[PDB]
């Protein structure tokens, strides 16, 4: 009865989306000129870790980055000189995500311990200390992002995401409805909305100020492992074990384009956009990362010399370089 | 060349590198084990004998063990399973007593079948393709009482064997040993009465055999 109501809505709404669907990115972008053959070359190789690298993040300065690996250590790298600024020994070795505060004063990490740890980089004692132990989740931490110096959003295996107040240590908001391990999230540039992908083969856009999902995106055949916003914060792209990448338009509530190739059969671990958004980068379980033209949906150039699954990938804020982390305990800077 | 500030920064980075290498070398000595039970399996009993991941470490015969169990992780095991890929071995606890016990959810799911299927899924995983498995069949006293007065046919319909009991225990042991497609990977099984005190010895022997097998693989004697 109420289930039938939900179905009829799901039906009418679909008949309405198809209405706002006359053209396709391709048809509209069939006259733009191809980007070319992007040929990036490793410029730096960070080889300090001793185990699989599971996450990495760039600082807003576009020079320092933080990477987390299963050896229970966080490393702050100076990409320009390949120097190690800090080495943070993690209480729990099972870390699967890390984040860099936009101000650069804090770094957050989390993993299979179900808690998110916040580390203070600027201290009078000149050492990295754990400032807060955000422990409200039930499942493993999946992703973390800093809204500001005192707010952070996390995703876990509870099929839920939470917004935290670091000083208080309490979840100020909770986002439920993913019915599947939330596996990643991204923050819009306006910093008032964010999206998350889950194993339920759907991604939902959330309003941080309110706390409720506004738009739910579907049409993805398998789990979702990576999500990233378009530079203008008006669309986003998602990876998956389906071996396909896709981007959706917030104001269209629809899929815009699909990035899949017959030769490619494997999952996608991470996605990222170039500064202008013309280039979409995605790490693959095939040990390599491909580069896709944003509008033409063509693999501009394959780009990887990693020895195992490319776990994490990130483009600098200045767009100057792209860093790829893999399960071979190696980080490579491509330019 | 570089300025004094960069010289100092490079010296700090080199010190960090040396410390990191020393920590890694020190940590590489211990052996890591993954504990994978099933509900009411005797994994809790094994741990007692000695909210997220629970780590229990101990030293036996100048050897350091790190035993991890994911019990509070109610999420899908498909994810985060790859984390324990470079692990020395697995520990699997099946309750012999489960032979006659539909799962608590009463989905007509034979407790043992759920375990047989769970064991099959764990053994034939992409990761953990070469990780020897230590199998524990505890609650022999229970199995011992139930095996008499109730047939194993209920669990294994194609019993075709004597009802009691060591033979029944061999049927179930072999049924678990099956569905191991990969060669060069052995499953060590033990019968636990729930009050024995040599399970540490058995796990130590299994780990030493695994280490010996690994060392004979480097020599190329796969």
């Amino acid at each position, epitope marked *: 009865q109420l289930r039938q109501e939900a179905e009829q809505l799901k039906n009418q709404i679909r008949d309405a989306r198809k209405a706002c669907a006359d053209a396709t990115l391709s048809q509209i972008t069939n006259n733009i000129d191809p980007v070319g053959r992007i040929q990036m070359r490793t410029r730096r190789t960070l080889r300090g870790h001793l185990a699989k690298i599971y996450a990495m993040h760039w600082g807003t300065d576009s020079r320092l980055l933080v990477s987390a690996s299963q050896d229970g250590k966080l490393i702050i790298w*100076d990409s320009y000189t390949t120097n190690k600024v800090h080495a943070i020994p993690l209480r729990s070795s099972w870390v699967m995500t890390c984040a860099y505060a936009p101000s650069g004063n804090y770094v957050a990490c989390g993993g299979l311990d179900n808690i998110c740890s916040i580390y203070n980089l*600027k201290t009078r004692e000149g050492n990295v200390r754990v400032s807060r132990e955000l422990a409200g989740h039930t499942g493993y931490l999946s992703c973390c992002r800093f809204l500001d110096d005192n707010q952070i959003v996390t995703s876990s295996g509870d099929t839920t995401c939470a917004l935290w107040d670091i000083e208080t240590g309490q979840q100020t908001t909770t986002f439920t409805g993913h019915t599947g391990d939330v596996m990643s999230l991204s923050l819009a540039p306006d910093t008032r909305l964010f999206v998350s992908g889950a194993c339920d083969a759907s991604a939902k856009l959330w309003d941080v100020r309110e706390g409720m999902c506004r738009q739910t995106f579907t049409g993805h055949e398998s789990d979702i492992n990576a999500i990233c916003f378009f530079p203008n914060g008006n669309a986003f792209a998602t990876g998956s074990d389906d071996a396909t990448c896709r981007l959706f338009d917030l104001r269209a509530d629809q899929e815009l384009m699909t990035y899949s190739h017959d030769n490619i059969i494997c999952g996608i671990t991470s996605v990222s956009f170039s500064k202008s958004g013309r280039l979409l980068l995605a790490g693959y379980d095939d040990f390599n990362c491909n580069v896709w033209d944003a509008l033409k949906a063509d693999r501009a150039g394959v780009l990887a010399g990693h020895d195992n699954r490319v776990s994490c990938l990130g483009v600098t804020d200045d767009g100057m370089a792209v860093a790829t982390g893999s399960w071979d305990s190696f980080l490579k800077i491509w330019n | 060349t570089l*300025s004094a500030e960069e010289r100092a*920064a490079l010296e700090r980075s080199k010190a960090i590198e040396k410390n990191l290498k020393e920590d890694g070398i020190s940590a590489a000595k211990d052996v890591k084990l993954l504990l994978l039970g099933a509900g009411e399996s005797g994994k809790s009993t094994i741990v007692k004998q000695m909210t997220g991941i629970v780590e229990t470490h101990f030293t036996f015969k100048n050897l350091h063990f790190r035993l991890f169990d994911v019990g509070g992780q109610r999420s899908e095991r498909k994810k985060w399973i790859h984390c324990f890929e470079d692990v020395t071995a697995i520990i699997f606890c099946v309750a012999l007593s489960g032979y006659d016990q539909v799962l608590h959810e009463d989905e007509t799911t034979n407790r043992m079948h759920e375990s047989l299927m769970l064991f099959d899924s764990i053994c034939n995983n992409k990761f953990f393709i070469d990780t020897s498995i230590i199998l524990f069949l505890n609650k022999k006293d229970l199995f011992g009482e139930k095996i008499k007065k109730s047939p194993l046919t209920i669990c294994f319909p194609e019993y075709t064997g004597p009802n009691t009991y060591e033979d029944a225990a061999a049927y179930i042991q072999a049924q678990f040993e099956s569905k191991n497609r990969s060669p060069n990977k052995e499953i060590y099984c033990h019968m636990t009465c729930a009050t024995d005190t040599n399970n540490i010895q058995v796990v130590f022997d299994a780990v030493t055999d695994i280490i010996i097998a690994n060392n004979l693989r480097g020599c190329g004697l796969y």
Partner: single-chain antibody
Amino acid sequence: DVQLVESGGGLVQPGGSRKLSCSASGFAFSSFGMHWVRQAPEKGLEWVAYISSGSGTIYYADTVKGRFTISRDDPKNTLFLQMTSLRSEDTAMYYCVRSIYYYGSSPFDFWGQGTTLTVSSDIVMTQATSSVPVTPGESVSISCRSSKSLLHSNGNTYLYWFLQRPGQSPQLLIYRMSNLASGVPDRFSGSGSGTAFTLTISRLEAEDVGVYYCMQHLEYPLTFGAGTKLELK
């Protein structure tokens, strides 16, 4: 919290030997490089010695070489300076300064209270002025000059500014002639070319009266300019 105390000074006849030490507490002493800075009884600041964080790098001044040795014992969080064949001009005031070197660091951020001692080429920073007549509520600028350009190929000009209020230890104000030390009023502002540097003080008050020193960290030995003093006409 963080503080450095040193006490090894006293009346020493010329040609003798003495040992100086400052105990470090409230911070990770083992992770900081330590410096010794000497100030003559009348005026002036001059670098003395430096020992790296891992005690793998050591430097000395010309006169310090061959007579002074710098040692540290991280377990006991203590810094040591050994004096031999002390000269009559060696009588001065000694400070031990912490300093940590990594990307975006603030070396020379904390200074000790110091210990007095009595007895009986290189870059030339040039703080031309020696006294500046000023009144509260009006701006003031102090300029520092260097012999060679401090702008490294990195893009960082290693120029530092310190304030030493009367009767108290000097404190870091600006590092790299563009950054502001933590817990420093925003009115301070450092800027300049690769060879000339200046400061801007807005709405000056009686609390800023003192002497300012500009130091270069481009290469050893570290050099200080004479100071520029402020008054209250």
